[PDB]
């Protein structure tokens with residue numbers, strides 16, 4: 001029955017208003033492979049809104065690995081890893097990821113989102129505490145909500161606030177600090193040295209979500225702990241397969257005893273179907289390529305350095321990025337929507353960040369680099385971004 | 395840091411004890427396609443522990459559709475549907491599913507698990523109520539936890555308890571009842587006529603999770619509402635792609651205004667990468683086959699009726715199944731583990747159900763049928779199940 005339900009959703013008018021004004025640019029239907037140029041409405045559009053940082057979703061070798069796994073293993077495992085859904089290739093990928101991030105063991109999940117829900121839901125219990133950076137990914141907030149522990153947020157990369165909040169807690173409780181490694185909105189990196197120093201002083205567990213770090217920072221792309229040399233001081237490395245690794249799924253890597261506990265207690269692995277064979281094989285081959293062909297991470301960083309320098313030359317106001325995410329401040333929700341749609345209609349795809357996710361005065365567009373971008377594509381996008389910011393009067 | 399973390403997991407000894415006794419049968423590593431016979435350790439094993447009810451993960455046409463989508467679209471969309479992750483084929487699948495279950499609109503999720511988290515997390519808020527059957531899937535419990543509403547459980551298929559609990563609630567609040575359609579443990583069907591009668595009397599929203607119903611009950615497999623003719627009285631039909639539909643992902647289907655609210659407010663669709671092209675195409679082709687080739691649902695039911703009658707003839711104690719899930723009571727955790735591993739070593743895969751998921755006296759094995767099973771395979775499994783129950787003394 002719909003009376004009260006109709007009421008609950010009656011106040012949500014922003015999509016109706018964006019569509020009526022001709023500004024709506026969510027769920028844009030792409031007709032081609034994810035690539036530096038995509039087809040939308042039969043038109044070619046430059047993609048600067050992706051998370052495919054190394055451009056590997058189009059690699060013929062990765063496509064072939066996925067097609068070969070469909071031929072051997074079929075379209076799906078039809079159950080949880082716990083029961084009838086484990087393949088020899090799931091276990092191969094866990095071993096390969098464990099070796100990559102320098103940990104004893106790993107457990108896969110069918111999504112990155114589910115990879116955060118697992119450990120955050122089941123390690124800390126009644127009378128325990130989870131400490132979250134206030135800018136942590138939604139999956140981390142939600143995982144922590146699913147725990148039976150007390151969740152405390154600390155100020156973004158604020159080590160005094162983290163120290164103070166931990167200082168207030170009973171000695172006779174378990175603590176877990178969970179942080180993004182690279183934070184996707186502004187593209188900044190966690191202060192892992194000071195966070196891990198604090199963790200060690202309070203005997204708190206440390207988990208890092210490397211969604212945006214894998215294939216980007218660290219030796220051969222191995223992530224945020226690898227970037228700082230702090231493998232030893234991080235208990236759990238979480239990552240996802242949907243960004244650099246060009247696939248779908250995620251993992252948590254850690255000590256064999258912790259991972260064994262997780263794989264038998266995390267509801268998001270016990271009660272959800274396992275990764276498709278095609279996604280296991282695509283992740284396996286992508287991981288091989290990232291490690292063996294250093295040119296991908298190199299070209300991503302050459303594109304990042306070039307685009308950041310060109311943006312600052314043209315006088316764009318950038319956020320404090322340390323990554324291939326270039327946040328360009330606009331500071332008006334209305335202008336952010338207008339700029340996004342005008343760039344779309346001029347053949348440039350960027351991602352808006354608006355209220356209520358951020359204050360209006362901190363609204364921005366995110367311009368993300370891939371290794372496969374050319375300096376010419378970057379120049380064409382920045383040209384068009386100069387023209388639209390002028391027409392919009394920023 | 396690991397001190398307190400080491401303590402939190404120190405008491406979890408059941409896996410260490412199962413492995414040491416040679417009884418462990420979780421995460422069994424399959425070396426072949428999910429099929430009526432699988433390869434484990436180079437040995438052939440009969441699969442009666444699957445959710446591939448129509449046996450479609452091996453259909454050459456579905457494999458080919460998935461391989462063709464990899465060729466055209468690559469290995470992954472590399473972002474949320476909300477931003478850069480929507481393909482023309484996502485929208486095609488939403489339209490096809492909406493038509494199938496007789497609803498205005500649908501939104502996909504990258505997992506079934508995530509398809510429950512979306513609506514349950516974001517429709518009911520502060521001062522609202524979610525009513526859950528006590529045997530609801532873990533994904534439904536967790537989705538409801540992620541809401542800011544008051545979650546109330548009612549006795550399993552207990553319509554007096556549901557009526558009473560709803561009667562106690564303020565008139566001036568929104569209510570949502572969420573139920574499995576087929577409940578996977580005992581294989582029983584929700585009393586949808588009485589639940590929807592109660593919902594209509596209290597103006598409560600109704601959501602049904604058709605994970606185990608799609609491709610099983612309803613006209614051409616269209617699910618639990620279709621089974622009862624109650625399309626009109628169910629607000630939201632949720633399903634998954636990982637069972638009959640031989641893939642990975644899920645959906646929620648409903649009125650256009652509700653679905654539009656969900657696709658812009660559900661954290662599990664806004665903040666998680668979209669389904670792989672290979673999984674969209676495999677789901678599309680599987681859905682076409684289920685509707686066009688009625689023989690699959692027919693043979694599933696012929697196998698279900700044959701196996702249930704053979705089991706009852708041999709005097710097995712079955713649960714109150716109305717589905718291709720045949721729950722066989724053992725009523726001892728120790729005997730349940732022993733029976734499961736002895737059947738595994740004799741070439742028969744079944745799924746155990748033990749404490750703490752159920753009371754020891756209600757421990758059982760689940761024996762699940764696929765359309766592709768033969769009467770000879772069924773006879774061989776039941777033969778072996780007679781022998782092992784004898785050796786175990788049940």
Ligand SMILES: Cc1ncc(COP(=O)(O)O)c(CN[C@](C)(CO)C(=O)O)c1O
Nearest residue numbers: 080271272273505506507531605634636
């Ligand atoms: C009733 C319902 N609802 C939702 C889901 C989640 O779907 P997903 O697996 O993510 O595609 C399951 C998964 N059920 C499985 C995986 C098999 O029954 C389990 O072991 O619990 C389920 O049984």
Ligand SMILES: Cc1ncc(COP(=O)(O)O)c(CN[C@](C)(CO)C(=O)O)c1O
Nearest residue numbers: 111112113137211240242474665666667
């Ligand atoms: C930091 C972190 N952690 C976990 C995830 C979940 O991974 P999954 O997408 O399920 O593979 C995301 C997804 N992030 C995306 C999808 C792209 O940034 C987003 O729009 O929020 C993420 O940014």
